[PDB]
Design a protein around this ligand. Sequence first.
Ligand SMILES: [Ca+2]
Lengths: 275, 269, 269, 274
Amino acid sequence: DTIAGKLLTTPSRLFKLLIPLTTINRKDIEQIAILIHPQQPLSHLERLIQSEVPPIEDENGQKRPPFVSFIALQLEQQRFIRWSQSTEIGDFIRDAARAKEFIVTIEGAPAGLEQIHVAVPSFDERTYFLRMRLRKISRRIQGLAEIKHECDALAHRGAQRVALGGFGILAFWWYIVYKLTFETDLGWDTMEPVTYLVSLSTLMGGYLWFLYHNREISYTINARQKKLYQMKGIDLQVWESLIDEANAIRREIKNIAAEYDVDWDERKDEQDDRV
Amino acid sequence: DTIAGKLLTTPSRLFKLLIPLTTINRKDIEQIAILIHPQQPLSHLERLIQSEVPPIEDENGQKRPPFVSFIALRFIRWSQSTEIGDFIRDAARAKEFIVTIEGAPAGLEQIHVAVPSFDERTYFLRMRLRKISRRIQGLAEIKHECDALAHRGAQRVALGGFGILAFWWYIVYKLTFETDLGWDTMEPVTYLVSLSTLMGGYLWFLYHNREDFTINARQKKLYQMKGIDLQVWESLIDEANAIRREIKNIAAEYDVDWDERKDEQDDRV
Amino acid sequence: DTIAGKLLTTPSRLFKLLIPLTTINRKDIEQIAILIHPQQPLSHLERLIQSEVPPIEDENGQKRPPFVSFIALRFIRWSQSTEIGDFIRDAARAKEFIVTIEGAPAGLEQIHVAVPSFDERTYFLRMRLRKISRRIQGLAEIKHECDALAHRGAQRVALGGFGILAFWWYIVYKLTFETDLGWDTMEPVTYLVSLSTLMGGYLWFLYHNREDFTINARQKKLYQMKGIDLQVWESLIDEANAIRREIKNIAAEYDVDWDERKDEQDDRV
Amino acid sequence: DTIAGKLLTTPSRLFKLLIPLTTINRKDIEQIAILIHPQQPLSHLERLIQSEVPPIEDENGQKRPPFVSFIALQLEQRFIRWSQSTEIGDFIRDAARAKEFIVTIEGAPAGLEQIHVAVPSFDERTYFLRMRLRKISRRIQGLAEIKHECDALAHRGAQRVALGGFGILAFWWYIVYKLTFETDLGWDTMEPVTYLVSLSTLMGGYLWFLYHNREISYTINARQKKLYQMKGIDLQVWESLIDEANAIRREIKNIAAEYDVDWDERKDEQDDRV
Ligand SMILES: [Ca+2]
């Protein structure tokens, strides 16, 4: 407005900042748009804001560029120290960003005060433009996880059916042994060897099923299912690629979170996936 | 020679461009080399060129260094913050690049460099991927024939065991169903043989020392001899896909469609 | 009167120093802040101090930069190729640091900065280590309580099962070893109960659906409710040890002995 | 000697190089040592060699120290001039694949007026990195062998109780044979006692199913965790030397990725023996 500014956070890597300053190409005072990359030296910013301002007339007559500066708040856990003209912008943004303070001293031109304060984006503000894409990719891997749960439901359909048939056959055997045993039409001593023979036969069949473990293609991955939900369903390369692209951003948000002394909790954004 | 240069890609991550400049004290042409990182600003390259050119004169009186301006594609000027990945991107579709230095030129006011492309840029990558994919393929097929070997040995030994136990079924059936010796004279044979195969199924635990060792574990024991482990293996496949997503990025953004079988068709030829 | 100065460690990786200089046309005293990464060479800092100071006229010809000289501790000049981390290391033992610009404005030509200590630097590490130690401690004891809780239910269910099966020992001892019904009238009770035991497993396998689920798996299912997973857990412990090896590095190089319980003695007081 | 130099690789991060040129009154030519960090700019290097040379008496005023310039080979799968403020390490890598580069002084006392310095090789860079890697790798292989022998101690502690179980089950086989075949007593009294024994060993084989008490893994057991640590050698040093050992292989494979020369540690398996 008058002595206030803001340095915004674009979704790209760049910044922008809007500062009011007098220019006679405009009428009185315009808030101007300046863009910044965080690997540019601070001399480029002072030359860039030095270029869109009508100059200070030299009282010696001959030397008319303006001489601008930058001053921050040295924190002692007041005091102010000026920053050299060849730091990168990003490191200064981080230091004054925890300081929550920024001024500019344009020499000569300011009629009164000559202290343009600007305001940095707080940790939540900086994070927001990361958290949107983080929440998006977490949402769609949650959906593909739900479809994996659906083919799990297919798997236990097959298991339940196979096991139901086995229980029916075991009930058949229990009734035929009881009927041919308690009725006293055949005694026990002709039912005992048939029991041992059947026990050998089911130890043979268990010796068949103990051979059956053909493929176990894991990584958490099955073998019956791997052809099932891929050659008719939804992919797995894209699943691991969204894992890979998803794991990177959380470290950046936690690094910037380390820079701001603010506890990053993703369970405090569990509440934002619902309303 | 005169107003023409070129930009080249290192085997590392960086770039290098070659521009015909005029240095502090030379003749009019010298193909000076400048090493740039691609995700980096553009004012950095402006500063790095303007370090090596004689400055502009008064100006009443100014000894200030020249001002370059990277117009590209008619003469759409580009700002001092767009990164070199994007400027080589849109210029790479344009196949043109103009650095118009001022003061220094004495009216020529132009420089043209030729942007490398996707076949050329990736060809460098393809070599990296072509070599590592061949190294995947050989170890793959050797691992497969080891799988066939351990599978065959396991099923032949299990087939022998089913042979002897089926023999036990046959002699119990014919001994107690012929009714020469009774089942009462057959009970000891069954239970005492059952402890005898707890014996013969228990000696193997201590001398030859299985301590699971199922069908799969014989193979996993086996290609400790015949091959290499799984960590190097998945590093090769996973890093191969890490290269493939990047050639999909660059060839996607350059908008020329590509599949990597088209140099497997040049691996043997 | 302003030959003083100090260097302060940022909470980030790269740290800054504060020196009194004269930039273009000012009064002689002004602090100027300069950001330094400790993997940069010394000559880089030499260049950044050369940027903001007026040049020196030396009689055909005027060197546009001055020349500074990072002597230290009895004075030993240090060459302009050492690491800044090493120069802060040996100077940190010395607790002194001297920059000496050749040009002297008016009888003042020296500058002392005061190299800080492992106390301040490693409380920019100790705040992190104390916070992660508190988090690990609380989550640890909650998981242990959860761990204790699972085994109570496991031993109750197992003790009940041993109760009824011991009853099955007593009833088959007493029914046929000493009493009226003989073993011939007892055998189908044993075998038919054995298939009836089996029926129980099938019912258990299908309605309440255990598809191992042993004693450890009740715990591992249980603190999915009461706690957090193991990957985050071992990430906190492993990164905590990564910080501990670095404070052992810095206190190993600055040579003041240290154990980290000595601030747990201030975590409650 | 006169037109050949070499830039070596010190055990530290920062290079050195030795080039012959003319100096103050002491000698005609001396291969002099220049110390270089790979992050200093190239103007620093030219100035460094511009400083230890007597200047040229240059008219039209006094601009006396020379202006030196670096030249390398632009591989075409010629000679270009590298700019005066690249960083040294990137120039080292690019001309390192070119295997030569050329310094030119302005004095030109020699007729050739060139200095073809030599380039450090893959065997030398990875020579020092390989000495570090093999030293720590041996230094964990010994502790791997001590893990092997305490594992053998656990093997002995198992084989005792397994031998006792085999002896007891042989005792049971013989007592069932004597009280069965002799016919002093008929099978119809050994049958009941067999079923009762089968219940009792299902109980004793049921209380062992609770005995899976601690399993502290990461590949790690729990029966031995007090034994090899609170009487033997640590595990913190084990995982720490793992952590310090995993980093260097990526650097050797990055520098190996630059030189287009294959990196095989099994071709260095042969160097741990002779
Ligand atoms: Ca019987």
